[PDB]
């Protein structure tokens, strides 16, 4: 995933 | 990607539910915000089912894969907004196209008015025709200019106000606008407006 579901 | 629908009207306490197709296949990495006028949006839901500490209980996410939910149980006066959904599977991460919540009411037939163009603006060299379609309900309205009863198109735009705060209407402005040799090269002017308040469609003219 990209965005906010790559900050991890 | 496709959210819908485009609109909605509800009353507080309603239930509603908003939908995000996502033909792919996204797993779970869909988000939902609202945004209200003149505002920044606000983060409600992320991965596809996880509530944002702080947003009411009565937002719910639901799905993975294609199809997702958004559920707003027991509307609030606050909840009146646009919501969004976002895809972030992959790059570019792109929103749905919208979805407004208004608030329901009986229906409303607008009052109709035109204005014929002030002898200054005349002299002006540029001449605007308005005709004003007041305090209706729903949204939805149409409105055609006739010039020599005949149909004009191309030299309108049309320009709406936010849902009244205290009657819950809107309010909507057409506005012709011609050169001032154009302007009178015809004689009489007309706009006709349709609207589901209308049992026909209402016409209001000048000529001079």
């Known amino acids: ?8 | 990607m496709t959210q819908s629908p485009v609109s909605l009207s509800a009353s507080v306490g309603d239930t509603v539910t908003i939908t995000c197709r996502a033909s792919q296949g996204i797993s779970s990495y869909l988000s939902w915000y609202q945004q209200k006028p003149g505002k920044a949006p606000k983060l409600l839901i992320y991965d596809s089912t996880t509530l944002q500490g702080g947003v009411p209980s009565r937002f719910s996410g639901s799905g993975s894969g294609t199809e997702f939910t958004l559920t707003i149980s027991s509307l609030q006066p606050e909840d009146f907004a646009t919501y969004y959904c976002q895809q972030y599977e992959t790059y570019p991460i792109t929103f749905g196209g919208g979805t407004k919540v208004d608030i329901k009411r009986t229906v409303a037939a607008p009052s109709v008015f035109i204005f014929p163009p002030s002898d200054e603006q005349l002299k002006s060299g540029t001449a605007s025709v308005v005709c004003l379609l007041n305090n209706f309900y729903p949204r939805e309205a149409k409105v055609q200019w006739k010039v020599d009863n005949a149909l004009q198109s191309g030299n309108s735009q049309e320009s709406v106000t936010e849902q009244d705060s205290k009657d819950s209407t809107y309010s909507l402005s057409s506005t012709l606008t011609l050169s001032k040799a154009d302007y009178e090269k015809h004689k009489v002017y007309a706009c006709e407006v349709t609207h589901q308040g209308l049992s026909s469609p209402v016409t209001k003219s000048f000529n001079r």
């Open chain 1, 1 to 8: 995933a990209v965005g906010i579901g790559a900050v991890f």
